[PDB]
Design a protein around this ligand. Structure first.
Ligand SMILES: [Mg+2]
Ligand SMILES: [Mg+2]
Length: 726
């Protein structure tokens, strides 16, 4: 008997919470289900926790919010049903989810572009082109800037979907092939200097970037610009085991010419301190030599002179030499020239006088009273100032590359923009430090921005449909965690870090003690663990993350010695001089301010949300793994959207469509009944449906989660029955 059967998604091992199987419900009580596992054991589950399986009619829906059992394994299942038909795009409420097929699919042709022109989301299948077109028409209709927030680690398709957005916009708004290629060739340059191998991804973005596609008031593409945010400069001087420095370093050493190698005095990576501690210098399946060629070509395409290109690589090389400088305490308080080979190599490439540099590194002068005093520094402080020099140099170089790229892109006659945002994703390593807290804070704020945007649209939808149901701002769900990190009163983690940083005698231990004293057992989003003395936990939208406090006081300071700045202002290199002559705040306060400026920008826009994901970690086509997929959906906020969506009345059916499907569940209700609302009510009343589970709108019946599934199950049963139920 087919239609008596009900299925459930369950975890064979609850602690592997994203690995599911399909079980069969056999018994039902007030508050629970009993079901049978795939191998035959019976289990129980509370109805409040149960993940029922949607009837087959729901398989393949284009928007996850149409699912009636809206739950995490059901979401995976729908994504899989579409993926197994080579439908890689699916909506989940406001999100567009894009799953990498790891093979070529011809869905980005000129015939496909044309189908999406002027079509609203509900008239065409899910597609990145559909997202792009709606953004473009909204921009013009509302005279408002747009943002596209696109997630995805390398391998997921984020770069390919960004390219598709740009290609589409150029096709619907171009008159502009040279601009488009210039925009696209920015990414290999920034990636070389802003991406790195971590333990979780071979090509991780360690910075955020907003690409503006600019339009004139008439709607034609008129230019572009790029803005960068929040580059992680700490990686330049230290990498954790098995990770790498920024790509550009390995690209330079592997693909440079023999003369370039000689001219810049460079050996292999493990010859250099900054690239030789992690134990990893190469990435399987990646050729740093080829990538370097790709970088060079991109720089040519976007207008970098050969003169500039050589000075860029001189600074990259200079940083490497600076890193191999070994300070030694010539016995006494101070540090000495140990061996001058690294310094002169750095000074050669930088165009700087070497004797000036070593003096500014170990014996910087700062005004004592109101006159100069040569401060001789010990080896420790000499190394840190050397490290701060490197980090200042890399970050100034990064900002210069951005400025140079923007110079070549036009920005005249801009009226509007459609902006693509690409930021470091939510990340949990084995050990998480201050860098991870900052990244995860950014993502908490970005998810709050999504949630709040969803809220404003849901408020309008319920108002328009005249639905008797109230709900509070979804963004409030994020506020406890955000306040715990960035709050002022009560002070959050970053405020307390700042308060401790001003005392030179503060320590790792005084800082963690202060954090525990403020938050342990007092804030539900914070955890003091029972056995670590150096870690605390924060409950993010994407899960708890444990943070290790070691070195955070030093990480929160970024002083640079003026004598170092003065030294580099004199240099021969045209680029180097720019880094220092174009024009007290802690790192945490900087991070907070830069994030606040990004958020301000985003608040002026109408946002669109694209979530690119990989189906598995083996780059294989036709292979989904729920564990892999659900981790990404948790981190990128799709499962947070589901959490919110499943709480109200997610399923919303035009009355006539409801009647066309379910008229047969009630006597004397015609399939094409004239008064569709009255027929809907007749079906619901005949079925004895609890009226708390639905609301009548002006044009649609709204259902709580699960209720439409039960009606569907009754239809499945009625069709194969010899008479109506008893
Ligand atoms: Mg990528
Ligand atoms: Mg994808």
């Amino acid at each position: 008997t087919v239609s008596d059967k009900r299925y459930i998604w369950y975890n064979p091992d609850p602690k592997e919470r994203d690995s599911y199987e399909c079980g069969e419900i056999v018994s039902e009580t007030s508050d629970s289900f009993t079901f049978k596992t795939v191998d035959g054991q019976d289990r129980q589950v509370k109805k409040d926790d149960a993940n029922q399986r949607n009837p087959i009619k729901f398989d393949g829906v284009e928007d996850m919010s149409e699912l009636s059992y809206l739950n995490e394994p059901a979401v995976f299942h729908n994504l899989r049903v579409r993926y197994n038909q080579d439908l890689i795009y699916t909506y989940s409420g406001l999100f567009l989810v894009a799953v990498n097929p790891f093979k070529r699919i011809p869905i980005y042709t000129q015939e496909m572009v044309d189908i999406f022109k002027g079509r609203r989301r509900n008239e065409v299948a899910p597609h990145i082109f559909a997202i792009s077109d709606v953004a473009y028409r909204s921009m013009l209709d509302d005279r408002q800037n747009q943002s596209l927030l696109i997630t995805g680690e390398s391998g997921a398709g984020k770069t390919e979907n960004t390219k598709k957005v740009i290609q589409y916009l150029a096709s619907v708004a171009g008159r502009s092939g040279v601009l488009e290629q210039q925009i696209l060739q920015a990414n290999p340059i920034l990636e070389a200097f802003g991406n790195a191998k971590t333990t979780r991804n071979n090509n991780s973005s360690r910075f955020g970037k907003f690409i503006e596609i600019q339009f004139n008031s008439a709607g034609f593409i008129s230019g572009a610009s790029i803005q960068s945010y929040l580059l992680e400069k700490s990686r330049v001087v230290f990498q954790s085991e098995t990770e790498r420095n920024y790509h550009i370093f390995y690209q330079l050493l592997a693909g440079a010419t023999a003369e370039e190698k000689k001219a810049l005095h460079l050996a292999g990576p493990e010859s250099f301190n900054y690239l030789n501690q992690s134990g990893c210098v190469d990435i399987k399946g990646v050729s740093d030599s080829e990538e370097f060629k790709i970088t060079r070509q991109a720089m040519d395409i976007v207008g970098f002179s050969q003169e500039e290109q050589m000075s860029i690589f001189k600074i990259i090389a200079g940083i490497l030499h600076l890193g191999n400088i070994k300070f030694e305490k010539g016995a006494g308080e101070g540090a000495v020239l140990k061996d001058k080979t690294a310094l002169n190599a750095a000074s050669t490439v930088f165009g700087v006088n070497p004797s000036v540099l070593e003096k500014a590194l170990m014996e910087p002068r700062i005004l004592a009273g109101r006159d100069l005093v040569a401060q001789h520094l010990n080896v420790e402080k000499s190394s840190s100032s050397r490290d701060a020099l490197v980090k200042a140099l890399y970050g100034r170089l990064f900002l210069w590359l951005v400025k140079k790229i923007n110079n070549v892109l036009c920005q005249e006659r801009k009226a509007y923009f459609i902006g693509v945002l690409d930021i470091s994703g939510f990340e949990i390593f084995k050990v998480n430090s201050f860098e991870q807290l900052c990244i995860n804070y950014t993502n908490e704020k970005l998810q709050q921005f999504f949630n709040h945007h969803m809220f404003k649209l849901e408020q309008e939808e319920y108002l328009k449909e005249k639905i008797n149901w109230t709900f509070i701002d979804f963004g409030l769900d994020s506020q406890a965690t955000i306040d715990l990190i960035d709050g002022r009163q009560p002070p959050g983690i970053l405020a307390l870090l700042d308060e401790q940083s001003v005392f030179p005698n503060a320590t790792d231990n005084t800082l963690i003690t202060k954090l525990h004293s403020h938050f342990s057992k007092k804030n539900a989003k914070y955890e003091e663990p029972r056995f670590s003395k150096t870690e605390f936990g924060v409950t993010h939208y994407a899960g708890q993350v444990m943070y290790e406090i070691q070195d955070w006081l030093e990480k929160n300071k970024d002083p640079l010695q003026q004598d170092l700045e003065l030294c580099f202002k004199d240099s021969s290199d045209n680029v180097v001089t720019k880094l220092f002559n174009d024009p007290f705040i802690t790192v945490a306060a900087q991070y907070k301010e830069q994030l606040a400026s990004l958020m301000a920008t985003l608040e002026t826009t109408n946002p669109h949300f694209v979530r690119c994901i990989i189906p598995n970690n083996k780059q294989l086509p036709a292979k989904l793994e729920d564990k892999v997929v659900l981790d990404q959906l948790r981190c990128n906020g799709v499962l947070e959207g589901i959490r919110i969506t499943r709480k109200g009345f997610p399923n919303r059916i035009i009355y006539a469509d409801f009647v066309k499907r379910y008229y047969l569940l009630a006597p004397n209700v015609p399939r094409d009944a004239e008064d569709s609302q009255k027929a809907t009510d007749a079906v619901l009343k005949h079925l004895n449906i609890d009226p708390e589970q639905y609301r009548f709108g002006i044009t649609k019946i709204f259902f709580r989660a699960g209720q439409l599934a039960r009606i569907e199950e009754a239809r499945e049963q009625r069709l194969e029955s010899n008479e109506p139920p008893m």
